[PDB]
Short mmCIF file of C-alpha atoms in Angstrom, two decimals:
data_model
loop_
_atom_site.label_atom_id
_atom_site.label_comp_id
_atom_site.label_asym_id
_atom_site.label_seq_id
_atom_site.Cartn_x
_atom_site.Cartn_y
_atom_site.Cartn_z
CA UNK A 1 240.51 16.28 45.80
CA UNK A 2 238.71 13.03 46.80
CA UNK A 3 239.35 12.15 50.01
CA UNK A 4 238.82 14.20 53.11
CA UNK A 5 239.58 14.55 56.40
CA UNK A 6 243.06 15.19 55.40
CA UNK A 7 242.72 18.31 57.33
CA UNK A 8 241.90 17.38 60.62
CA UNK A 9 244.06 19.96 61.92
CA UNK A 10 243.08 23.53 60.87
CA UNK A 11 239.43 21.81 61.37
CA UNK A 12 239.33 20.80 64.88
CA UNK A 13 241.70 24.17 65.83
CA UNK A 14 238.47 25.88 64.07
CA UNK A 15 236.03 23.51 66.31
CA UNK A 16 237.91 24.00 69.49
CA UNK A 17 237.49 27.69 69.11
CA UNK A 18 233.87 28.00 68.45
CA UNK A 19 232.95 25.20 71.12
CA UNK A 20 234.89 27.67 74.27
CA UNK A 21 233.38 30.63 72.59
CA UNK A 22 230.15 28.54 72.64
CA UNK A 23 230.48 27.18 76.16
CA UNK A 24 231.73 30.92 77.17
CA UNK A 25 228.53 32.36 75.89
CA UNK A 26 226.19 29.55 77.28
CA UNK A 27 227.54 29.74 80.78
CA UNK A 28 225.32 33.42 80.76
CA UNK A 29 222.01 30.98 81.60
CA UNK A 30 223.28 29.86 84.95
CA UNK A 31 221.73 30.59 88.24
CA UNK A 32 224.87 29.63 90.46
CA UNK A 33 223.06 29.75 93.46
CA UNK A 34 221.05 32.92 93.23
CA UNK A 35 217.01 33.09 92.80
CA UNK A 36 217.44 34.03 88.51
CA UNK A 37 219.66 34.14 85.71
CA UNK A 38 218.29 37.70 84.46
CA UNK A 39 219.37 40.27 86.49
CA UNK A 40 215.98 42.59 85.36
CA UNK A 41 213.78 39.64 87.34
CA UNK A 42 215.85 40.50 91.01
CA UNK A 43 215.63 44.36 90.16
CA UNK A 44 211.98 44.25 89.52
CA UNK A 45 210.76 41.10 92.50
CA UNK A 46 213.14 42.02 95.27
CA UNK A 47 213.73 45.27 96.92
CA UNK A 48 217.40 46.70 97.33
CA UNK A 49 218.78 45.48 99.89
CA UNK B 1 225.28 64.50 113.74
CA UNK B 2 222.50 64.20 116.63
CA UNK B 3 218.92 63.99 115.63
CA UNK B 4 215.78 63.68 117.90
CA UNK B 5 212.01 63.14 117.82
CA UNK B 6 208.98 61.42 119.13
CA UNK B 7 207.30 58.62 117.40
CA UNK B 8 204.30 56.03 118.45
CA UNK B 9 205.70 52.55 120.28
CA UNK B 10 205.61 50.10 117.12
CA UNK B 11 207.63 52.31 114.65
CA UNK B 12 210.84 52.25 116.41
CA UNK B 13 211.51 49.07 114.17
CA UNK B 14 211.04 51.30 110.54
CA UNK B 15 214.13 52.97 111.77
CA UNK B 16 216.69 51.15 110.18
CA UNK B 17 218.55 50.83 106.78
CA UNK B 18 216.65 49.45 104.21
CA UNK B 19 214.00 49.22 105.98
CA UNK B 20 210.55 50.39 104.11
CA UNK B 21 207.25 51.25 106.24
CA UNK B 22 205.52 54.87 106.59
CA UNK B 23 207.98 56.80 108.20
CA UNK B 24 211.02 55.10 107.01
CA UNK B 25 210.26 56.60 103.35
CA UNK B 26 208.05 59.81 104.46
CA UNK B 27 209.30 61.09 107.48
CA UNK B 28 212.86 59.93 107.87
CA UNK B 29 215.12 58.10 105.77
CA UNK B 30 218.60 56.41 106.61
CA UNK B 31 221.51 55.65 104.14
CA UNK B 32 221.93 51.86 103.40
CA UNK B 33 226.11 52.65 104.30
CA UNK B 34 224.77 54.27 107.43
CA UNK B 35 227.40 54.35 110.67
CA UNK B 36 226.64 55.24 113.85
CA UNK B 37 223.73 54.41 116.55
CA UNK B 38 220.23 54.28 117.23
CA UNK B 39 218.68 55.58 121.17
CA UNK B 40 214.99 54.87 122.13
CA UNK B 41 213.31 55.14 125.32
CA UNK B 42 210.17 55.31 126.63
CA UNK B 43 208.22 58.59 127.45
CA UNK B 44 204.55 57.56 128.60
CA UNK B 45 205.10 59.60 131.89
CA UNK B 46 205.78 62.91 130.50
CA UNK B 47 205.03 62.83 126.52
CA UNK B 48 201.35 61.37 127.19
CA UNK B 49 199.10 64.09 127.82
CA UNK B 50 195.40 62.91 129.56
#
């Protein structure tokens, strides 16, 4: 009842879970190498080709 | 598939894929997966009329 961190299993299997789906959801934002990371800003700047 | 006609000297470059201009979207327009090959000569001697 008092003391904590008693746990530190089920917690950090918890944390480790919601940091990749973090890092999964974050990696979205990344130009890697293009001009933009939206894909409406090439559709509407650049023509087709 | 052979198709022919006469055009002025400085739109022979609009003819191409994904290429935009005047005639390359209102005259004549090529696929961007286009396959085949492109002929132009010139015809001052015989297409030029006085």
């Amino acid at each position: 009842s008092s003391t904590a961190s008693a746990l530190g299993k089920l917690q950090d299997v918890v944390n480790q879970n919601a940091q990749a789906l973090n890092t999964l959801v974050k990696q979205l934002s990344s130009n890697f190498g293009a001009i933009s990371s939206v894909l409406n800003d090439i559709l509407s700047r650049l023509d087709p080709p | 598939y052979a198709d022919s006609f006469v055009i002025r000297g400085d739109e022979v470059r609009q003819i191409a894929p994904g290429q935009t201009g005047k005639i390359a979207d209102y005259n004549y327009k090529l696929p961007d997966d286009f396959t085949g090959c492109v002929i132009a000569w010139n015809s001052n001697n015989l297409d030029s009329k006085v």
